[PDB]
């Protein structure tokens, strides 16, 4: 019954589309980013990557049993960490840069200590308790981490204790992606039930549910100001939702795009929305007008992960091609 | 790379590359198999005789060949969202219990076989089909007819006819016979038989892949 009430409220608050309001601003124009660095050394399909807050180091996890830490400026490998399970499907980089985390078809999340006095990266802790593959993980502090899994639930962990302080439930299917708010007080998750939910980390309960996708949501990203996020699903469209309005603002789709999105990211100012595709291309979108500003066509197999530096200087794109390209 | 410690970093990177290449060479010499089948299909005995909380990895060596078997059936999560991780496995091992007339359960096994075999990732991957628990199946067929599972089965209620019928129903599910082959084995108690069948199937797969590469297949 309340579904009708929610739909009625949403239609009541819907007066003008984002496209019409943004018709008054000039277009971005052609965005011709060129590959500045090609990070090679992974011998299998790359499934996730993450930038360091210094906007110079980045970690990439692949299914060859290794996740490597690169010096993006010089392409040097700072670390190469062997994994007990080679089915890593995600990776993360602590805001302080001290730790990294990863997980996969083994339902545990492994946290690695990069600053060990012994000079080698050690497994700080293994977080177990999920009953499905780990889809995503994101650090809040050096002691807290939030993870999502095909268990259809997300959980907040106390790394020191090793137990999940809070468990987030409500998804009807595998949770495929997750994104922390800029202040790390809220996060959103995309699941295979074609819905996204906004969670209160402190309270541990869902705030809002966003629908509109026709297939599993593979990727999700927060708009830089923290009041909106963009989802990318298998129906070959990205979508932008606003938390305050609890509504869809704009969808980013094109007729000749017939494959699903695997990744989503925003530029520092939020004007450009970048999304990876199974068409082994990344399409840059004018976030305000839905126009495709450019295409980062440099990969062969599939773009499975991409991210923009906190500095806004560059965007890296990993792929099943086993290479990461840095565009600027 | 023009300072004292910006050159040591490059040397460290070169050493890391060396180790990565060595590990990749080491891991390319291991045959990778995907093990599938329902919980009651007898996968447990198969794994036990091979070796004698999500994915379970099993390593075993038979006649100079290293096998890695990935038992994925432990997790209930959606299959289409991680099955592509196993693209490139040499072969798929599918376990079926011939005594599956209880729940039928044979129908579920057939649906799973059809789903896996005709997957777009496994277009070229062959399947090593194991039809386990033939003894209890022989007790059951005497006790109950196969018509309880296959009403269209007009043949006699004997081991040979029913087993051949089951094999034909399973091998008829692959829509790309021109690309892949199915190796069907009625699992025997002798442990060596199953590992020998796996070795034979994998050897034939490798030989036929080489023949395809040479343009002779």
């Amino acid at each position, epitope marked *: 019954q309340l579904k009708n009430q929610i739909r009625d409220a949403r239609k009541a608050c819907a007066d003008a589309t984002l496209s019409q309001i943004t018709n008054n601003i000039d277009p971005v124009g052609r965005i011709q980013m060129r590959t500045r660095r090609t990070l090679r050394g992974h011998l299998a399909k790359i499934y996730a990557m993450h930038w360091g807050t210094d906007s110079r180091l980045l970690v990439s996890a692949s299914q060859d049993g290794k996740l490597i830490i690169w010096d993006s400026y010089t392409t040097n490998k700072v670390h190469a960490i062997p994994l007990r399970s080679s089915w890593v499907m995600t990776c993360a980089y602590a805001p302080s840069g001290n730790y990294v985390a990863c997980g996969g078809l083994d339902n545990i999340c492994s946290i690695y200590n990069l600053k060990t006095r012994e000079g080698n990266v050690r497994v700080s802790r293994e977080l177990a308790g999920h009953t499905g593959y780990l889809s995503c993980c994101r650090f809040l502090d050096d002691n807290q981490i939030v993870t999502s899994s095909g268990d259809t639930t997300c959980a907040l962990w106390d790394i020191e204790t090793g137990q999940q302080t809070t468990t987030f439930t409500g998804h009807t299917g595998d949770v495929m992606s997750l994104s922390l708010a800029p202040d790390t007080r809220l996060f959103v998750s995309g699941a295979c039930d074609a819905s996204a939910k906004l969670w209160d980390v402190r309270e541990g309960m869902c705030r809002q549910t966003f629908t509109g996708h026709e297939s599993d949501i593979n990727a999700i990203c927060f708009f830089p100001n923290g009041n909106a996020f963009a989802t990318g699903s298998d129906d070959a469209t990205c979508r932008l939702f606003d938390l305050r309005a609890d509504q869809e603002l704009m969808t980013y789709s094109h007729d000749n795009i017939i494959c699903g999105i695997t990744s989503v990211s925003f530029s520092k100012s939020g004007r450009l929305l970048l999304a990876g595709y199974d068409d082994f291309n990344c399409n840059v979108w004018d976030a305000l007008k839905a126009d495709r500003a450019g295409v980062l066509a440099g990969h062969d197999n599939r773009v499975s992960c991409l991210g923009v530096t906190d500095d806004g200087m560059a965007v890296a794109t990993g792929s099943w091609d086993s290479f990461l390209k840095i565009w600027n | 790379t023009l300072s004292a410690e910006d050159k040591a970093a490059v040397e460290r990177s070169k*050493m890391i590359d060396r180790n990565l290449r060595e590990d990749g060479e080491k891991a390319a010499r291991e045959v990778k198999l995907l093990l599938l089948g329902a919980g009651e299909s007898g996968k447990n005995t198969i794994v036990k005789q091979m070796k004698i909380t999500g994915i379970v990895e099993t390593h075993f060596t038979f006649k100079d060949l290293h096998f890695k078997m990935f038992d994925v059936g432990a997790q209930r999560s959606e299959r289409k969202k991680w099955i592509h991780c196993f693209e490139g496995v040499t072969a798929i091992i599918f376990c079926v219990a011939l005594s599956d007339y209880d729940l039928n359960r044979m129908h579920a096994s057939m649906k799973l076989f059809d789903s896996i075999c005709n997957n777009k990732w496994f277009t070229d991957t062959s399947i090593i089909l194991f039809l386990n628990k033939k003894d209890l199946f022989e007790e059951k067929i005497k006790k109950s007819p196969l018509t309880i599972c296959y009403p269209e089965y007009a043949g006699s209620n004997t081991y040979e006819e029913a087993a051949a019928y089951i094999q034909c129903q399973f091998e008829d599910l692959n829509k790309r016979k021109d690309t892949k082959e199915i190796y069907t084995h009625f699992t025997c108690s002798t442990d060596t038989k199953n590992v020998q069948f796996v070795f034979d199937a994998v050897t034939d797969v490798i030989i036929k892949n080489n023949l395809k590469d040479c343009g002779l297949f």
Partner: single-chain antibody
Amino acid sequence: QLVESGGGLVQPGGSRKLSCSASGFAFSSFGMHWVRQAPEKGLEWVAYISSGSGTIYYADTVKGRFTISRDDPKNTLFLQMTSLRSEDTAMYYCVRSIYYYGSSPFDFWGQGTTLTVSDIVMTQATSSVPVTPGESVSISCRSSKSLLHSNGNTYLYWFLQRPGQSPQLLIYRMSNLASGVPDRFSGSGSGTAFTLTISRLEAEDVGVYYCMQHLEYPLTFGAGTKLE
């Protein structure tokens, strides 16, 4: 921890093998240095061997006479010394050093072993600086050549050698503070002139402060400024 052995009385023109047993860390990943110190003089870098032994460097005053090698399986570092002169008499330290973006070379120093045979010039302004606890002190240094590299890193290092103890890294690359160093110490400077500032000095800060450049391979040290 690093433990060194092999020193003692030596006749001139002889030979001696100094060894360092490394335990408690991944010896194979660290590049290792030998740093010596005459009985009453400052530190002098001797030789360097990288991880995997791919790169070896020697001081101009030891090249050809001194040989450095590793035993990674046994985690032991060696220094073969031949045709030892009288000037070779010095305490020899083995210094841990790992190079990657953001690392802190020279972080851990061994306890040293005494041997007794019976270039960017860097100058430190003052030799002795009387002080009492609670005061703020500044140690000054100067280099003949600019230590600022094209990549922005100023390769200056500060080491504190308390009386009767081996040197411990204080600051690396002129700004960064080594792990475990009290927040009292702060490093600053630019180009060819640098300073080390100690705020609310305590009794444990008494010692000799040595400056070192890591811009080029000879790894020159300063004369050393004493606080007392």
